[PDB]
Amino acid sequence: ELPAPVKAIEKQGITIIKTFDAPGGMKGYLGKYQDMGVTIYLTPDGKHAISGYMYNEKGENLSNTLIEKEIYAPAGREMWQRMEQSHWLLDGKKDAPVIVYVFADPFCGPCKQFWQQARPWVDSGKVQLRTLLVGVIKPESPATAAAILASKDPAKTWQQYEASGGKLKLNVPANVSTEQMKVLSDNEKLMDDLGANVMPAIYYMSKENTLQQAVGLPDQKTLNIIMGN
Amino acid sequence: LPAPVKAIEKQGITIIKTFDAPGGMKGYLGKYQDMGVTIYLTPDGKHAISGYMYNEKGENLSNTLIEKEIYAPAGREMWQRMEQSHWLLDGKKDAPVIVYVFADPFCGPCKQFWQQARPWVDSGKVQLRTLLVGVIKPESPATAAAILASKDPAKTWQQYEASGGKLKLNVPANVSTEQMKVLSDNEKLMDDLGANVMPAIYYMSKENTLQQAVGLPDQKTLNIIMGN
């Protein structure tokens, strides 16, 4: 179905997703190479095609913009909304401009270190952390997570738990209640879909409104990026 | 962070996580713009290599890892949402290759794709699972609902596509509430997937990552959709 120059580019290992309208009398083709988006532009003469990246007068990489909006953004918007709708615990001001979701377990050492790393931004009102608790690392992870979900102020209990390094004493109930069992079960199902079993599993949005991830304790550059610097 | 890795960070790489690599090497998974990157710290601890690691059998382990950690997760939730929808089966229920397609009764390219798929569907290798929507023409909703309302909706849809839309239908007095829900749910999922042109085709790669094709596929894309 494809113009010959585009078929030649196909043979270099590119699979075509869709056509699109491009500037300057050029027809666009969006494709993938090993799951990375690629853009191809058919020239006006119709007898040549260019595989590469298009830039505009303002210096914007329009090919990256298009690949982000058409390939990556839809799955990211959906995961972001799913986390938004889950039972997360608030850490920081409800009006903090930067939102960060974190999967955490009570017996995760690195989760508490990341909790400490976040304090300067959280305690200044810049970032809110939204924790999705799971109970998967240790045998008592489910009950311990359930005990904090059961407390009168779960979000405050979680802060005390992380700040104290897990030394905070709890009243653990006779069993995980059906409501608490649902929260934990849903949170691990969202964690599984996201592909990280190591914690903290940190999710945040790029300036391009694409979902980004950090797993384990971030280094200084990744931390500063997560926190919106 | 080890100094050679910090130098690579300054080239525009944001690190996601560490991982274990062969031979006393530590791995770092990262991104450059939209691109997944692997970095390997040398045993001496004083050098790092940004690139792709291969094993004796010739597998690109960096690509395997980048696919599993960065790309495979993005697809799963959309895939299950399509599975849970009210799709119509075209082919064997046990066919190993599953292909979802958003389609409208008045989409011309959808019927051409339906024809292209016949060799794989008829062989039992591929099942097409059609998510009907009613968006193209004023009569698209009523016609899609009529097909959902038929005695054997999956068979009516196949006959409808095979006939180029000439198949005559029994039209009901209105769209039922369940049919209306099916059409509305399918249209909202299609919107979330970001493609409004049809056929909008969704399928899984050999690497278990979600892929999309929009419009009538060319020969190479068709072979890939069908699992060749």
- With tokens 């009006």, the residue in question is A95
Show residues of chain A in contact with B80, CB under 8 Å: 193
For domain B1-70, the CATH superfamily is: Disulphide bond isomerase, DsbC/G, N-terminal (3.10.450.70)
- Whether residues A78 and B213 touch (CB distance < 8 A) is answered with no
Burial class of residue B207, CB neighbours in 10 A (0-12, 13-18, 19+): middle
Q: Which candidate, B162, B171, B108, B112, places its Cα nearest to that of B144?
A: B171
User: Best residue in B33, B54, B67, B224 to probe A by mutation, most A CBs within 10 Å?
Assistant: B33
- Whether residues B73 and A17 touch (CB distance < 8 A) is answered with no
- With tokens 């198949």, the residue in question is B167
Sequence-ordered list of residues with C-beta below 8 angstroms from that of B65, at least 6 positions apart, any chain = B19, B29, B38
- With tokens 């050029």, the residue in question is A26
User: Best residue in A78, A194, A205 to probe B by mutation, most B CBs within 10 Å?
Assistant: A78
3-class SS of residue B111: helix
Show residues of chain B in contact with A216, CB under 8 Å: 17-18
Map out the domains of chain B as residue ranges. Answer: 1-70, 71-228
- CA-based nearest distance A21→chain B, Å: 13
The H-or-E segment that residue B117 falls in is helix B108-123
Sequence-ordered list of residues with C-beta below 8 angstroms from that of A229, at least 6 positions apart, any chain = none
Sequence-ordered list of residues with C-beta below 8 angstroms from that of B88, at least 6 positions apart, any chain = B129, B130, B132, B153, B154, B157
Q: Is the domain A1-71 a CATH 3.40.30.10 member?
A: no
Q: Decide if A1-71 and A72-229 have a common fold.
A: no
HSE at residue B182, side-chain half, CA atoms within 13 A, is 24
Torsion angle of the four alpha carbons A198, A202, A207, A211, in this order, in degrees rounded to the nearest 10: 60
Sequence-ordered list of residues with C-beta below 8 angstroms from that of B140, at least 6 positions apart, any chain = B104, B105, B106, B133, B134
- Judge contact between B160 and B108, C-beta under 8 A: no
CB pairs under 8 A between A and B: 108
DSSP string, B57-104: T--BHHHHHHIIIIIHHHHHHHHHHHHTS-PEEES-TT-SEEEEEEE-
Among candidates A36, A195, A222 on the partner chain, residue whose Cβ is nearest the Cβ of B15: A222
Long-range contacts of B195-198 (CB under 8 A, 24+ apart): B195/A18, B195/B102, B196/B135, B197/A18, B198/B102, B198/B103, B198/B104, B198/B107, B198/B109, B198/B110, B198/B133, B198/B136
- Whether residues B15 and A67 touch (CB distance < 8 A) is answered with no
Residue A79 CA, distance from chain mean position: 7
Show residues of chain A in contact with B14, CB under 8 Å: 212, 221-222, 225
- Whether residues A16 and B218 touch (CB distance < 8 A) is answered with yes
Q: Closest-CA residue in chain A for B215? A: A18
CATH of B71-228, one of 3.60.15.10, 3.10.20.440, 3.40.30.10, 3.30.930.10: 3.40.30.10
The angle, 0 to 180 degrees and rounded to 10, between the axes of the packed helices B177-193 and A73-84 is 120
Sequence-ordered list of residues with C-beta below 8 angstroms from that of A195, at least 6 positions apart, any chain = B68, B69, B70, B72, B73, B76
- Whether residues B215 and A19 touch (CB distance < 8 A) is answered with yes
Say how far apart CA A209 and CA A222 lie, in whole Å: 17
Say how far apart CA B30 and CA B66 lie, in whole Å: 9
- Judge contact between A227 and A126, C-beta under 8 A: yes
DSSP string, A89-152: EEES-TT-SEEEEEEE-TT-HHHHHHHHHHHHHHTTTSEEEEEEE---SSTTHHHHHHHHHHSS
- Judge contact between A131 and A158, C-beta under 8 A: yes
Neighbours of B50 (CB within 10 A): 18
Q: How far is CA A60 from CA A27, A56, B203, in A?
A: 19, 6, 31
Sequence-ordered list of residues with C-beta below 8 angstroms from that of B193, at least 6 positions apart, any chain = A74, B78, B102, B200, B202, B212
- CA-based nearest distance A175→chain B, Å: 30
Say how far apart CA A164 and CA A152 lie, in whole Å: 18
Q: Which candidate, B218, B151, B124, B63, places its Cα nearest to that of A9?
A: B218
Show residues of chain A in contact with B219, CB under 8 Å: 1
Show residues of chain B in contact with A67, CB under 8 Å: 34
DSSP lists the bridge partners of residue B134 as: none
CATH of A72-229, one of 1.10.3720.10, 3.30.360.10, 3.40.50.10600, 3.40.30.10: 3.40.30.10
Backbone angles phi, psi at B196, to 5 degrees: -105, -20
